[PDB]
Design a protein around this motif. Sequence first.
Motif, PDB file in Angstrom:
ATOM      1  N   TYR A  10      63.073 -28.422  19.059  1.00  0.00           N
ATOM      2  CA  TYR A  10      61.792 -28.327  18.369  1.00  0.00           C
ATOM      3  C   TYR A  10      61.911 -27.463  17.120  1.00  0.00           C
ATOM      4  O   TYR A  10      62.558 -26.417  17.134  1.00  0.00           O
ATOM      5  CB  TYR A  10      60.713 -27.778  19.302  1.00  0.00           C
ATOM      6  CG  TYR A  10      60.203 -28.814  20.272  1.00  0.00           C
ATOM      7  CD1 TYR A  10      59.020 -29.494  20.027  1.00  0.00           C
ATOM      8  CD2 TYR A  10      60.918 -29.132  21.418  1.00  0.00           C
ATOM      9  CE1 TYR A  10      58.552 -30.452  20.903  1.00  0.00           C
ATOM     10  CE2 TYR A  10      60.459 -30.090  22.303  1.00  0.00           C
ATOM     11  CZ  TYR A  10      59.275 -30.746  22.038  1.00  0.00           C
ATOM     12  OH  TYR A  10      58.809 -31.704  22.909  1.00  0.00           O
ATOM     13  N   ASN A  16      55.952 -18.083  13.324  1.00  0.00           N
ATOM     14  CA  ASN A  16      55.426 -17.322  14.455  1.00  0.00           C
ATOM     15  C   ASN A  16      56.184 -16.019  14.678  1.00  0.00           C
ATOM     16  O   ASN A  16      56.088 -15.410  15.745  1.00  0.00           O
ATOM     17  CB  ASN A  16      55.449 -18.165  15.734  1.00  0.00           C
ATOM     18  CG  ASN A  16      56.852 -18.369  16.273  1.00  0.00           C
ATOM     19  OD1 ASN A  16      57.838 -18.079  15.596  1.00  0.00           O
ATOM     20  ND2 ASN A  16      56.948 -18.870  17.500  1.00  0.00           N
ATOM     21  N   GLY A 116      49.383 -30.545  26.282  1.00  0.00           N
ATOM     22  CA  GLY A 116      49.266 -29.683  27.455  1.00  0.00           C
ATOM     23  C   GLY A 116      47.840 -29.281  27.777  1.00  0.00           C
ATOM     24  O   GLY A 116      47.601 -28.261  28.423  1.00  0.00           O
ATOM     25  N   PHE A 198      60.013 -24.475  32.072  1.00  0.00           N
ATOM     26  CA  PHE A 198      59.775 -23.070  31.761  1.00  0.00           C
ATOM     27  C   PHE A 198      58.288 -22.741  31.698  1.00  0.00           C
ATOM     28  O   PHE A 198      57.451 -23.642  31.638  1.00  0.00           O
ATOM     29  CB  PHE A 198      60.505 -22.659  30.475  1.00  0.00           C
ATOM     30  CG  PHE A 198      60.205 -23.535  29.289  1.00  0.00           C
ATOM     31  CD1 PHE A 198      59.160 -23.230  28.432  1.00  0.00           C
ATOM     32  CD2 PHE A 198      60.983 -24.650  29.019  1.00  0.00           C
ATOM     33  CE1 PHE A 198      58.887 -24.029  27.338  1.00  0.00           C
ATOM     34  CE2 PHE A 198      60.714 -25.453  27.927  1.00  0.00           C
ATOM     35  CZ  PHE A 198      59.666 -25.142  27.085  1.00  0.00           C
ATOM     36  N   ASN A 199      57.970 -21.446  31.716  1.00  0.00           N
ATOM     37  CA  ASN A 199      56.592 -20.993  31.884  1.00  0.00           C
ATOM     38  C   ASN A 199      55.951 -21.753  33.044  1.00  0.00           C
ATOM     39  O   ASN A 199      54.785 -22.146  32.974  1.00  0.00           O
ATOM     40  CB  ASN A 199      55.780 -21.194  30.598  1.00  0.00           C
ATOM     41  CG  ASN A 199      56.362 -20.447  29.405  1.00  0.00           C
ATOM     42  OD1 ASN A 199      56.802 -19.303  29.522  1.00  0.00           O
ATOM     43  ND2 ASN A 199      56.351 -21.091  28.244  1.00  0.00           N
ATOM     44  N   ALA A 257      62.835 -14.792  25.109  1.00  0.00           N
ATOM     45  CA  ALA A 257      61.552 -14.613  24.435  1.00  0.00           C
ATOM     46  C   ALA A 257      60.880 -15.931  24.057  1.00  0.00           C
ATOM     47  O   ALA A 257      59.699 -15.955  23.711  1.00  0.00           O
ATOM     48  CB  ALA A 257      61.715 -13.729  23.204  1.00  0.00           C
ATOM     49  N   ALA A 259      60.219 -18.233  26.028  1.00  0.00           N
ATOM     50  CA  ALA A 259      59.331 -18.549  27.141  1.00  0.00           C
ATOM     51  C   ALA A 259      58.861 -17.249  27.787  1.00  0.00           C
ATOM     52  O   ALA A 259      59.420 -16.806  28.788  1.00  0.00           O
ATOM     53  CB  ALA A 259      60.040 -19.427  28.157  1.00  0.00           C
TER      54      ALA A 259
HETATM   55  C1  LIG Z   1      47.683 -26.633  31.467  1.00  0.00           C
HETATM   56  C2  LIG Z   1      48.745 -25.774  30.848  1.00  0.00           C
HETATM   57  O1  LIG Z   1      48.824 -25.652  29.626  1.00  0.00           O
HETATM   58  N1  LIG Z   1      49.580 -25.167  31.684  1.00  0.00           N
HETATM   59  C3  LIG Z   1      49.724 -23.724  31.737  1.00  0.00           C
HETATM   60  C4  LIG Z   1      49.994 -23.154  30.345  1.00  0.00           C
HETATM   61  O2  LIG Z   1      48.813 -23.171  29.576  1.00  0.00           O
HETATM   62  C5  LIG Z   1      50.474 -21.717  30.479  1.00  0.00           C
HETATM   63  O3  LIG Z   1      50.833 -21.162  29.242  1.00  0.00           O
HETATM   64  C6  LIG Z   1      51.392 -22.171  28.395  1.00  0.00           C
HETATM   65  O4  LIG Z   1      52.716 -22.535  28.713  1.00  0.00           O
HETATM   66  C7  LIG Z   1      53.216 -23.551  27.865  1.00  0.00           C
HETATM   67  C8  LIG Z   1      54.615 -23.925  28.339  1.00  0.00           C
HETATM   68  O5  LIG Z   1      54.549 -24.493  29.628  1.00  0.00           O
HETATM   69  C9  LIG Z   1      53.257 -23.080  26.407  1.00  0.00           C
HETATM   70  O6  LIG Z   1      53.571 -24.132  25.512  1.00  0.00           O
HETATM   71  C10 LIG Z   1      55.003 -24.320  25.425  1.00  0.00           C
HETATM   72  O7  LIG Z   1      55.764 -23.129  25.521  1.00  0.00           O
HETATM   73  C11 LIG Z   1      56.121 -22.527  24.291  1.00  0.00           C
HETATM   74  C12 LIG Z   1      56.195 -21.017  24.456  1.00  0.00           C
HETATM   75  O8  LIG Z   1      56.998 -20.719  25.574  1.00  0.00           O
HETATM   76  C13 LIG Z   1      55.135 -22.872  23.183  1.00  0.00           C
HETATM   77  O9  LIG Z   1      55.511 -22.142  22.035  1.00  0.00           O
HETATM   78  C14 LIG Z   1      54.367 -21.706  21.273  1.00  0.00           C
HETATM   79  O10 LIG Z   1      53.896 -22.704  20.390  1.00  0.00           O
HETATM   80  C15 LIG Z   1      52.761 -22.324  19.635  1.00  0.00           C
HETATM   81  C16 LIG Z   1      52.323 -23.499  18.769  1.00  0.00           C
HETATM   82  O11 LIG Z   1      51.918 -24.568  19.594  1.00  0.00           O
HETATM   83  C17 LIG Z   1      53.084 -21.106  18.773  1.00  0.00           C
HETATM   84  O12 LIG Z   1      51.941 -20.660  18.077  1.00  0.00           O
HETATM   85  C18 LIG Z   1      53.591 -19.970  19.642  1.00  0.00           C
HETATM   86  O13 LIG Z   1      54.001 -18.907  18.814  1.00  0.00           O
HETATM   87  C19 LIG Z   1      54.758 -20.459  20.484  1.00  0.00           C
HETATM   88  N2  LIG Z   1      55.216 -19.398  21.362  1.00  0.00           N
HETATM   89  C20 LIG Z   1      56.487 -19.004  21.352  1.00  0.00           C
HETATM   90  C21 LIG Z   1      56.848 -17.879  22.278  1.00  0.00           C
HETATM   91  O14 LIG Z   1      57.340 -19.518  20.633  1.00  0.00           O
HETATM   92  C22 LIG Z   1      55.209 -24.359  22.894  1.00  0.00           C
HETATM   93  O15 LIG Z   1      54.022 -24.764  22.249  1.00  0.00           O
HETATM   94  C23 LIG Z   1      55.402 -25.133  24.196  1.00  0.00           C
HETATM   95  N3  LIG Z   1      56.784 -25.514  24.351  1.00  0.00           N
HETATM   96  C24 LIG Z   1      57.062 -26.710  23.880  1.00  0.00           C
HETATM   97  C25 LIG Z   1      58.401 -27.318  24.175  1.00  0.00           C
HETATM   98  O16 LIG Z   1      56.204 -27.279  23.223  1.00  0.00           O
HETATM   99  C26 LIG Z   1      51.945 -22.459  25.950  1.00  0.00           C
HETATM  100  O17 LIG Z   1      52.212 -21.687  24.804  1.00  0.00           O
HETATM  101  C27 LIG Z   1      51.349 -21.551  27.013  1.00  0.00           C
HETATM  102  N4  LIG Z   1      49.972 -21.223  26.696  1.00  0.00           N
HETATM  103  C28 LIG Z   1      49.501 -19.984  26.812  1.00  0.00           C
HETATM  104  C29 LIG Z   1      48.243 -19.818  27.614  1.00  0.00           C
HETATM  105  O18 LIG Z   1      50.046 -19.008  26.299  1.00  0.00           O
HETATM  106  C30 LIG Z   1      51.673 -21.665  31.401  1.00  0.00           C
HETATM  107  C31 LIG Z   1      52.243 -20.256  31.438  1.00  0.00           C
HETATM  108  O19 LIG Z   1      51.186 -19.323  31.422  1.00  0.00           O
HETATM  109  O20 LIG Z   1      51.222 -22.029  32.682  1.00  0.00           O
HETATM  110  C32 LIG Z   1      50.831 -23.386  32.741  1.00  0.00           C
HETATM  111  O21 LIG Z   1      50.379 -23.675  34.046  1.00  0.00           O
END
Ligand SMILES: CC(=O)N[C@@H]1[C@@H](O)[C@H](O[C@@H]2O[C@H](CO)[C@@H](O[C@@H]3O[C@H](CO)[C@@H](O[C@@H]4O[C@H](CO)[C@@H](O)[C@H](O)[C@H]4NC(C)=O)[C@H](O)[C@H]3NC(C)=O)[C@H](O)[C@H]2NC(C)=O)[C@@H](CO)O[C@H]1O
Length: 327
Positions: A10, A16, A116, A198-199, A257, A259
């Motif tokens: 990605y 960010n 998501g 992850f996460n 970091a 995730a």
């Molecule tokens: C229903 C649902 O969404 N499920 C729960 C999640 O909401 C919850 O938290 C979210 O976890 C997801 C990953 O599963 C995460 O999105 C992915 O993870 C990375 C970060 O690890 C994201 O990276 C971010 O992208 C945004 C732009 O879209 C940036 O602004 C931000 O700076 C990025 N963060 C980092 C550290 O780089 C990705 O968008 C995405 N990965 C991919 C491959 O796209 C969400 O960010 C999480 N949302 C929250 C609430 O923070 C999860 C864990 O709490 O639990 C699920 O059940």
Amino acid sequence: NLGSKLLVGYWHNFDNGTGIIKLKDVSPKWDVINVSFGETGGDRSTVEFSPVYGTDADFKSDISYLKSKGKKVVLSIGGQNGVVLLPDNAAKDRFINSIQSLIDKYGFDGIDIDLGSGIYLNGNDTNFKNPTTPQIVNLISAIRTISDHYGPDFLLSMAPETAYVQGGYSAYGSIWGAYLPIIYGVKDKLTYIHVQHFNAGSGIGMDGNNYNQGTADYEVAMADMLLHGFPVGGNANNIFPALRSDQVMIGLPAAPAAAPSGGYISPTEMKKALNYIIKGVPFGGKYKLSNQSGYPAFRGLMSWSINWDAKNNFEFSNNYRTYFDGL
Ligand SMILES: CC(=O)N[C@@H]1[C@@H](O)[C@H](O[C@@H]2O[C@H](CO)[C@@H](O[C@@H]3O[C@H](CO)[C@@H](O[C@@H]4O[C@H](CO)[C@@H](O)[C@H](O)[C@H]4NC(C)=O)[C@H](O)[C@H]3NC(C)=O)[C@H](O)[C@H]2NC(C)=O)[C@@H](CO)O[C@H]1O
């Protein structure tokens, strides 16, 4: 065209804290670049995209350059801060048109579905082969329409969280199993799926055992469900069919970091999982692979993200590129 062992990364169309990497400075180790993200405004249906650097022409030019080097450049729709809602045909049409416009405008090789939120199985939506929830029905329709509008080399991928896929083993409703009808509905057009390992906390394998994210056992258990298929929602008569092995990838954080809620796995541990999945070589783990001798056609690894990787000594790209090249 596309290799049999891929690294999909990605690419941040935003800063960010990990900074901006110009497309031409992206490591050649990545086979596919998922531009992140196409996003929606008020109507949550029209997808927009403007490059974080350069003019529209400049960006298109950089993409053309990558494509000339054999790389694929894909537009990712989502993610954390992206939302697409298709409650009716009018919304679906705006979605299709907006996406097609973008693909043409910049020359994207395909699209990645990284939604998501806003995806739920409604009450009574019980059959993954015949979904009834508008969001899901319309997404499937739109994806098929867009795919049909382009040539044989159109790339379609998706990166759902585990609850939406493997979670279907536990329940089928709300978010649980919600991507299963999407996957099934577009399986003939799906290049590959890379679930976000992850996460995710913990996950239940087809053996009914619970595994913790970021462990070799967990990686194998979660991937095996797509490689082998599994019963849905505790119903032995409702089996989700295996995908082609070449349609199965695993999505991983490039760095701890990347995730913040966990999920990162060391390359050393991940290689154990890969050797088991691909070659059927065990590593003393608790999980027993469905296929004794492995799934050699397993497609590869996805990572969040190219930007995080570059910030982490290129650990992900260097380790796994060498691993896959060595096969
Ligand atoms: C229903 C649902 O969404 N499920 C729960 C999640 O909401 C919850 O938290 C979210 O976890 C997801 C990953 O599963 C995460 O999105 C992915 O993870 C990375 C970060 O690890 C994201 O990276 C971010 O992208 C945004 C732009 O879209 C940036 O602004 C931000 O700076 C990025 N963060 C980092 C550290 O780089 C990705 O968008 C995405 N990965 C991919 C491959 O796209 C969400 O960010 C999480 N949302 C929250 C609430 O923070 C999860 C864990 O709490 O639990 C699920 O059940």
